[PDB]
Write a protein that binds this ligand. Structure first.
Ligand SMILES: C[C@H](CCOc1ccc(I)cc1)CCN1CCN(c2ccncc2)C1=O
Ligand SMILES: C[C@H](CCOc1ccc(I)cc1)CCN1CCN(c2ccncc2)C1=O
Lengths: 297, 48, 97, 245, 49, 297, 245
């Protein structure tokens, strides 16, 4: 039981997060209403105080004499799904015959889509994102030719054995999901769910993955969050002998059922590495075009 | 104890030194008890 | 409220009125200390100048919250922010802000 | 009536006679974790007044050439008062914050500081200048503690992103001719209900001068900027021995 | 400057608990303070003086 | 508001101290009821388990065949007031003419009753005690003779000026309570209230009065609690000239309206000092009489 | 059914299969300070689970010649876990305690320890033997910390009072042929509603062997005695910087 007054009247425990704003329906752009001349004192829409931290509330109607305009322009193409649900390149896997990379007929690709600027800059507009995705795999030789080769793609979740060769036992794929397809077939395509242990993936994690001292040699782990590491994607030519053709696998991702939180400024310096926001210090360029004088176009 | 949180800022033309006057008293939950003579007795010899 | 002689250092007759007020002035932004005093109302010190402190001397025990109101008498163009703290028993004179 | 204000929480009270309203980040107040979002099973400890109070941790000096600074939360408090202890003894932590940046001058000084809160403020390095060396920021730069850290290249927030767009985050400006402080209230922001106060910094506080401080010879040249902050709805769990990192 | 004492109370300056104050104000009334016999005169009647 | 379940159901704040025992009226000793032989199994009143920490519950009726006895013996003389409300010596103040102590016609006595064994041992049976008291002052010369001398007793509460002489200004006694009486009058007598800042005086305080280091030279303060220090009792002969007679003032205290808490073991070693429980180590004596053998009286 | 028991509080649980019931000192359970007994006005902090839990602070070895030991509360905890921190940062403190003294042996060992709680346990000195020197016990003897302290003259409890009458205080006995632990719950005992955890020790825990430990050559000779205790209804007030003494 609770008897002392300060305990009875405390708010310790309130799980209801009070919200100051609520979403309203906005299928079309706001209309413009008629307005006339106003010669008042006390009234001053044009004057603002940006220091407060809010954007101006001044509207067209209050700054000039406007007519009536019935705006039916749609806001549909700017929803999250409309913006992100467009397949883009997020990975390239080479399987050359005579080479320095994967001359063994198989390859392991760490599932990370930050190796491509276009896609990367879009998602980095938000801190947290939760979504499902549709992956499409386009394969062919380096000239873009199609050859009668059978391939096997396999998803190796964290903790599952990564194949170490074209003949690995792991290709038995008794539990991992695998896709067998020919380069002659249309691109393979599958749906992937939201698999993080967290309520959402996050493109930025300001912290370390473990406890302890964070000395120089371990700074490679600053910003690494296991919650974003979904595993490995493995590919191999299906045979005990080397393939007769060199291959290339392009991986396209199309998000769907998207939710995002906490918008951020958009990248304005060239990307350098997948794992971080490092930029070239000797080449810090302005965000945009420049001119000779502020009084000239 | 009294500390400077920011700093005493003043423009050109105004004194670089100003003073503060402290005024004290008791709140409404203040009470006293066990009446006694004050520690001081303002008299040396006899008051004539 | 009566005037608390926080600045109880001058003793010569000609400088007695200086006990009624302490100063503040442009510093070096290092959260420097301005002044200190015990909050004990019935103890020798700054409180002896107040009527509260004197009346207090006619009673053996007291109980209650006290309050000190500080009035800045600088020019209108002078600005500033101060941190005034009260350190309950056991806490030694704060070494820093 | 919007210029004057008093903030009282715990055994601390703040006053200001030249404020510019209060910002409540992302439109919502700090709240304790609900029984449905929670996952950890142990009963949490909610110290209340002993930890949710105003702490005045640091003071920097604004100069005609300052570049700007940043502090990471809850890194700044992990070693202060009862909050620090709870953050050290416990594995799990969550809370909100009330940030009050202070800076007064005279009616003859001028300048404007942008005060913002940027969640998951990951720091980058200049990559050896040529961008060929894959360097990484040291612990003392990622979690600068209470002294904060000075921005090397404010234009890109030492992270390759335009400061010109930082206003998309909860913020306020300290325009000397208008106000002498900024006040931002921030709710818990993370993709998890609780996290380590030591290994993860939920957001960073940025104080950057966009319009350079200026005044004529003879005016007080020492213009400090002080940082006061109060945790809100602090909750801790997963008790054991104290750990500093 | 107005000439009045501060109206600020404990409740408004810090988070306070509830306290039922039963401390009496009886010993500070005028009679309580003054109704205590004290010396106000001495009269000497010496022999040789 | 409170929403999370653990907060709603917590007992944090319960000011109602649950009690396991309640006092019953017992004006007389318990009666004895009739009883007969019992030859049962399972029943065993005689067997106890002192380890538990409780006293035996075995009664006369269950250990032997008893008759009926209507006990009307009163329990009145063992109440706290009955025990303590008996005036006893707690102070002696000497005012000699030619002497080494108080040859100035006045004396200051620190109000502490621990200088006398009889009274001291009684009160030290309890840790905390709250009470009012009646003080009686018996004065005379050292032979027990009564002389025409006028005296002034004055109570100097902590903070009031202690007289430094027979002619001190403090004897104006404008606020302090004073008593003027002749050795020829009967003993002076007054009522004293419960004056501590604490809810009760305490004969034992296991701690220090202040914060800081507690080095050797400050160990004199271990066990000193200001809450027990009520002030000084001053006495003087009423005149600017020395009194013609040597005097002795015996101070008797009779408590009334007494309340006590936390009983303790009773002193079994001679007292040495007022301020502490120090005992003579080389003379630790048994609590009582001893004998030659355990099998002989 | 009175021999078996489990004590769970906080994130700690104690078990025993040879208990002798539980003693609740002076017949009452620990309770938080009421609004009428209270006097301090600031809102208290009641950490709850982070401080009201079982702490296992010390282990002594019972021997055929041991004299007995004592610990002072809350002195023993002032430097442990979150309780210690709260006791240091705050001027005012109050709480109850659940004490569980442990000591097991074999069905072939014998002995009996008296476990008691004595409020305001003021320590005295032997006065230089002759009783002429007015000596005083040093800080390390009055507030022995967690290591406790050994009784010099148990018969008089180093304070001139008969141990034979110590049973007038909340107590239990650990008779090896009967039980392997004592459990005493103690409410806040003082003439004030709150006090300093540093300057004042509300009571002392005494563990004294009245019946000497014994066994035959060949039986495990190392018979430990461990002290576990849990604060109850801890309340703190008067916050400021941490102070150790
Ligand atoms: C949508 C992918 C997971 C795709 O998972 C599979 C699984 C099986 C298959 I067949 C194909 C794809 C996750 C992309 N994310 C999640 C966040 N993240 C990341 C990368 C770098 N830095 C931070 C986060 C990142 O690259
Ligand atoms: C009843 C006395 C107070 C008597 O106060 C007056 C006041 C005025 C007059 I005229 C006569 C007596 C207090 C006795 N006590 C309170 C507890 N205490 C004490 C002494 C030594 N160690 C611990 C407590 C002790 O000696």
């Amino acid at each position: 039981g609770d008897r002392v007054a300060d305990v009875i009247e405390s708010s310790i425990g309130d799980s209801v997060s009070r919200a100051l704003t609520h979403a309203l329906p906005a299928p079309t752009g706001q209309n413009t209403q008629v307005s006339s001349h106003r010669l008042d004192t006390g009234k001053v829409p044009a004057l603002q105080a940006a220091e407060i931290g809010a954007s101006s509330n001044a509207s067209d109607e209050s700054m000039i004499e406007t007519r009536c305009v019935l705006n039916s322009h749609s806001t549909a193409e700017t929803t999250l799904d409309s913006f992100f649900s467009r397949a883009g390149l997020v990975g390239e896997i080479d399987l050359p015959l005579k080479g320095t990379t994967n001359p063994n007929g198989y390859a392991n690709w760490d599932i990370d889509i930050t190796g491509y600027a276009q896609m990367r800059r879009k998602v980095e507009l938000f801190t947290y994102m939760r979504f499902d995705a549709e992956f499409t795999f386009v394969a062919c030789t380096p000239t873009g030719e199609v050859v009668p080769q059978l391939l096997q793609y396999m998803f190796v979740p964290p903790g599952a054995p990564k194949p170490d060769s074209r003949e690995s036992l792991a290709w038995q794929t008794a539990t991992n999901p695998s896709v067998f397809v020919k380069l002659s077939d249309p691109p393979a395509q599958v749906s992937v769910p939201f698999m993080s242990p967290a309520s959402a993936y996050q493109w930025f994690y300001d912290g370390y993955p473990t406890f302890g001292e964070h000395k120089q040699e371990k700074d490679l782990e600053y910003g690494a969050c296991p919650n974003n590491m979904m595993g490995t994607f493995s590919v191999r030519t299906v045979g005990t002998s080397k393939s007769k053709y060199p291959l290339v696998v392009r991986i396209y991702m199309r998000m769907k059922h998207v939710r995002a939180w906490i918008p951020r400024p958009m990248r304005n310096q060239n990307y350098l590495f997948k794992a971080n926001p490092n930029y070239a210090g000797n080449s810090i360029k302005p965000t945009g075009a420049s001119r000779t004088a502020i009084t000239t176009l | 104890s009294i500390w400077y949180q920011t700093n005493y800022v003043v423009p050109i033309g105004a004194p670089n030194t100003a003073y503060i006057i402290a005024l004290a008293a008791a709140q409404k939950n203040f009470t006293m008890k066990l009446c006694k003579d004050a520690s001081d007795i303002l008299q040396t010899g006899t008051i004539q | 409220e009566t005037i608390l002689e926080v600045n109880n250092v001058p003793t010569n007759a000609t400088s007695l009125m200086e006990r009624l007020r302490f100063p503040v002035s442009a510093q070096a932004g290092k959260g420097e200390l301005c002044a200190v005093f015990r909050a004990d109302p019935g103890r020798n010190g700054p409180w002896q100048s107040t009527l509260l402190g004197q009346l207090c001397g006619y009673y053996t025990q007291w109980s209650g919250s006290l309050e000190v109101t500080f009035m800045f008498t600088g020019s209108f163009m002078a600005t500033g922010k101060m941190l005034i703290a009260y350190t309950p028993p056991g806490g030694p004179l704060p070494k820093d802000r | 009536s919007d210029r004057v204000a008093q903030l009282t929480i715990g055994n601390s009270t703040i006053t200001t006679q030249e404020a510019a309203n209060i910002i409540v980040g992302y439109g919502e107040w700090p709240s304790y974790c609900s029984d449905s979002d929670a996952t950890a099973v142990d009963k949490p400890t909610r110290p209340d007044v002993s930890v949710n109070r105003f702490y005045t941790l640091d003071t920097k000096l604004w100069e005609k050439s300052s570049k700007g600074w940043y502090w990471k939360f809850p890194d700044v408090l992990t070693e202060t008062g009862v909050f620090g202890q709870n953050a050290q003894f416990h594995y799990l932590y969550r809370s909100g914050f009330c940030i009050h940046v202070q800076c007064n001058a005279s009616k003859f000084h001028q300048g404007a500081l942008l005060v913002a809160v940027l969640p998951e403020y990951v720091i980058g390095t200049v990559a050896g200048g040529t961008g060929t060396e894959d360097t990484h920021p040291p612990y003392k730069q990622t979690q600068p503690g209470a002294d904060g850290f000075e921005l090397q290249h404010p234009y890109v927030l030492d992270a390759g992103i335009p400061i010109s767009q930082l206003t998309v985050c909860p913020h306020q400006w300290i325009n000397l001719r208008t106000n002498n402080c900024a006040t931002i209230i921030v709710p818990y922001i993370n993709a998890l209900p609780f996290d380590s106060a030591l290994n993860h910094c939920n957001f960073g506080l940025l104080v950057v001068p966009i319009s350079p401080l200026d005044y004529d010879q003879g005016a007080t040249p020492v213009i400090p900027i002080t940082i006061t902050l109060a945790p809100m709805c602090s909750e801790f769990a997963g008790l054991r021995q104290a750990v500093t990192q």
